[PDB]
Design an enzyme around this catalytic site. Structure first.
Site, mmCIF file in Angstrom:
data_model
loop_
_atom_site.group_PDB
_atom_site.id
_atom_site.type_symbol
_atom_site.label_atom_id
_atom_site.label_comp_id
_atom_site.label_asym_id
_atom_site.label_seq_id
_atom_site.Cartn_x
_atom_site.Cartn_y
_atom_site.Cartn_z
ATOM 1 N N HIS B 41 0.814 -1.215 0.000
ATOM 2 C CA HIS B 41 0.000 0.000 0.000
ATOM 3 C C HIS B 41 0.851 1.270 0.000
ATOM 4 C CE1 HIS B 41 0.254 -0.448 4.558
ATOM 5 N NE2 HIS B 41 0.592 0.818 4.389
ATOM 6 N N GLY B 143 3.473 5.855 9.331
ATOM 7 C CA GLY B 143 4.837 5.727 8.877
ATOM 8 C C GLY B 143 5.556 4.489 9.371
ATOM 9 N N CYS B 145 4.655 1.430 8.872
ATOM 10 C CA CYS B 145 4.526 0.337 7.918
ATOM 11 C C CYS B 145 5.885 -0.033 7.339
ATOM 12 C CB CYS B 145 3.560 0.730 6.799
ATOM 13 S SG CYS B 145 1.886 1.041 7.382
HETATM 14 C C1 LIG Z 1 1.222 2.636 7.746
HETATM 15 N N1 LIG Z 1 2.384 3.335 7.984
HETATM 16 C C2 LIG Z 1 0.043 2.789 8.662
HETATM 17 C C3 LIG Z 1 0.452 2.478 10.074
HETATM 18 C C4 LIG Z 1 -0.748 2.496 10.976
HETATM 19 C C5 LIG Z 1 -1.299 3.904 11.165
HETATM 20 C C6 LIG Z 1 -1.482 4.072 12.664
HETATM 21 N N2 LIG Z 1 -0.830 2.898 13.232
HETATM 22 C C7 LIG Z 1 -0.399 1.980 12.366
HETATM 23 O O1 LIG Z 1 0.162 0.928 12.646
HETATM 24 N N3 LIG Z 1 -1.023 1.886 8.230
HETATM 25 C C8 LIG Z 1 -2.124 2.304 7.611
HETATM 26 O O2 LIG Z 1 -2.460 3.487 7.636
HETATM 27 C C9 LIG Z 1 -2.965 1.233 6.972
HETATM 28 C C10 LIG Z 1 -2.936 1.386 5.442
HETATM 29 C C11 LIG Z 1 -4.314 1.840 5.045
HETATM 30 C C12 LIG Z 1 -5.174 1.944 6.317
HETATM 31 N N4 LIG Z 1 -4.330 1.491 7.428
HETATM 32 C C13 LIG Z 1 -4.704 1.364 8.731
HETATM 33 O O3 LIG Z 1 -3.909 0.983 9.597
HETATM 34 C C14 LIG Z 1 -6.133 1.713 9.072
HETATM 35 N N5 LIG Z 1 -6.789 0.539 9.652
HETATM 36 C C15 LIG Z 1 -7.894 -0.026 9.160
HETATM 37 O O4 LIG Z 1 -8.460 0.419 8.167
HETATM 38 C C16 LIG Z 1 -8.349 -1.231 9.937
HETATM 39 F F1 LIG Z 1 -9.329 -0.873 10.763
HETATM 40 F F2 LIG Z 1 -8.794 -2.153 9.079
HETATM 41 F F3 LIG Z 1 -7.320 -1.720 10.631
HETATM 42 C C17 LIG Z 1 -6.146 2.899 10.014
HETATM 43 C C18 LIG Z 1 -7.613 3.203 10.345
HETATM 44 C C19 LIG Z 1 -5.516 4.100 9.287
HETATM 45 C C20 LIG Z 1 -5.359 2.590 11.301
HETATM 46 C C21 LIG Z 1 -3.885 0.394 4.772
HETATM 47 C C22 LIG Z 1 -3.613 0.036 3.340
HETATM 48 C C23 LIG Z 1 -4.424 -0.826 5.473
#
Ligand SMILES: *C(=N)[C@H](C[C@@H]1CCNC1=O)NC(=O)[C@@H]1[C@@H]2[C@H](CN1C(=O)[C@@H](NC(=O)C(F)(F)F)C(C)(C)C)C2(C)C
Ligand SMILES: *C(=N)[C@H](C[C@@H]1CCNC1=O)NC(=O)[C@@H]1[C@@H]2[C@H](CN1C(=O)[C@@H](NC(=O)C(F)(F)F)C(C)(C)C)C2(C)C
Lengths: 305, 303
Positions: B41, B143, B145
């Protein structure tokens, strides 16, 4: 989100860990530039430790009695000195992996990362705090002496702790990197005890701010209190007093959450008075006190090195 | 003596963390040999994440869209492919700091170290367990990820986790290094459910052995139980059932303390039924379950 006890990356420190052998004894050393630092009781036999005369033991030793090995390499000793409770061994080779570093002496309540080592090989890393009684609640077996504690400022490694011994009740004692003990301890196998320990109040407040940032709010109450009223109660419960300096350090966390520090002190007051009633905060059933206000800001903002 | 939640030394993994930039999005990658691995992603916009078609989104990207920075130096991307939920970017430089490594898929209850990173730079290291519901309880900001979890076997780094997302409850989800998710989650910003978590019983028993080894014995009893007796009790409290294989894993600890696995189980049953009476074990007011029987042996015998 989430909130974990987190240690600094240990890579910079791993590159400075070496094995030091004197006679039968084998322990760990810290290799910075062309000096190797280690606990001085490496020169001791198990008989010597009950009441050692380090000055006498050392003068009897020559440079070729000290074996320093840095992995596959073998460092040639060309000098040995004693400063307080650390041996300084000059070597023919400067550590090419020496990071930017300081030697610092931390105050109680400050945290740091420990790199536990055996035979010069890093075994694991964990985070701890200098307790108000100048002990640390660590994890150390025989042969862990010379393992060091550190903080990292972007790229500069502040070494604050070298490990020496274990006290009654399984707590631990050691020195700054100049060989001066934290607390009233001596490197002799004799009857010593740490002294009553107290809770680090400013860290508990920082941890309560970490909780609110992460959604745990059930403990916030409508009351408030003066600093002197809070401290009156806190010392009743064996909590270190909160000072105006502690209030200022908590400023960033206070301004992020819009919760006045003295308002949070009132929440804490009721927590010590009415207990937690089996409820938890960030998963813990006890109040956590080994996160400094700086630790909390780092983990919640994503600071890197 | 003493017992701490302890992570592996993170040095070998620090040398593999790079920054991956694709358009506006930035996240962490893992640089091994002439390949960089990162969550796929990284190719999504703010809008795309709500319902991505990754094949179509990737079809519109080119090698020159991907900017990999390793420290200061920028790496040249000369190829890309998608393996499940990770992007694999071929680069023109094998990582000279590449350690001996393998990719593994871990089971629930197993533990690993996480090197949490932002913009390809390490922030911190901590220990966690793969929960029975295939989540982990971590500390992850935006960030994070591409941060990875890992074990170290002497000199070999076994990578088992790459971080992708955070679930509603604040827990976290990710993949193995082939890009297959742990659990039933997808890399899409839509409401998802982890499901009922349970306690890792065999780890709790391992922690109790660590307690006995460290002098905290007040919970021991000469009481006994059968595996079926204990398991019937354990399921009432949402504890994973204890198998004979778990009993065999606990064997070294039992032999080191002279306490039968099933005597200890009788103490855990007593603990679940009667609470802790305000007592603590290894300074904890709750039963810890993120130490495997191997972790306890390692820490208490110094591997
Ligand atoms: C990537 N760096 C982030 C790290 C996240 C953000 C806060 N804590 C973390 O570990 N990951 C994301 O933003 C991923 C990315 C899109 C949405 N996402 C999520 O983690 C979202 N979660 C969900 O949609 C759920 F509920 F299914 F877990 C979010 C609401 C932003 C935390 C993708 C592609 C999954
Ligand atoms: C380093 N090689 C070990 C590490 C210790 C041993 C067990 N856990 C640790 O952290 N250090 C020692 O063996 C030092 C060494 C002689 C005795 N010693 C102790 O730690 C002893 N402690 C004390 O005498 C006390 F209680 F005062 F701290 C021991 C009873 C063996 C734990 C010297 C020079 C202090």
């Amino acid at each position: 989100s989430g909130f974990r006890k987190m240690a600094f990356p240990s890579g910079k420190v791993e590159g400075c860990m070496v094995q030091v052998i004197c006679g039968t004894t084998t322990l760990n050393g810290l290799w910075l530039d062309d000096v190797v630092y280690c606990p001085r009781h490496v020169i001791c036999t198990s008989e010597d430790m009950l009441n050692p005369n380090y000055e006498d033991l050392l003068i009897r030793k020559s440079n070729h009695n000290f074996l320093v090995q840095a992995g596959n390499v073998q460092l040639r000793v060309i000098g040995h000195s004693m400063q307080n409770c650390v041996l300084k061994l000059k070597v023919d080779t400067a550590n090419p992996k020496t990071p930017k570093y300081k030697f610092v002496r931390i105050q109680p309540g400050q945290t740091f990362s420990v790199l536990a080592c055996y035979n010069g090989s890093p075994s694991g890393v964990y985070q701890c705090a200098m307790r108000p009684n100048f002990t640390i609640k660590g994890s150390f077996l025989n042969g862990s002496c010379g393992s060091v504690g550190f903080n990292i400022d972007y790229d500069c490694v502040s070494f604050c702790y070298m490990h020496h011994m274990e006290l009654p009740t399984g707590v631990h004692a050691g020195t700054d990197l100049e060989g001066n003990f934290y607390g009233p301890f001596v490197d002799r196998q004799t009857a010593q005890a740490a002294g009553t320990d107290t809770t680090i109040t400013v860290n508990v407040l920082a941890w309560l701010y970490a909780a609110v940032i992460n959604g745990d709010r059930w403990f916030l109450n409508r009351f408030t209190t003066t600093l002197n009223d809070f401290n009156l109660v806190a010392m009743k419960y064996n909590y270190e007093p909160l000072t105006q300096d502690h209030v200022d350090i908590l400023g960033p966390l206070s301004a992020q959450t819009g919760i006045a520090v003295l308002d949070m002190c009132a929440s804490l007051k009721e927590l010590l008075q009415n207990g937690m009633n089996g409820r938890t905060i960030l998963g813990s059933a006890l109040l956590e006190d080994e996160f400094t206000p700086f630790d909390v800001v780092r983990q919640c903002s994503g600071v890197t090195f």
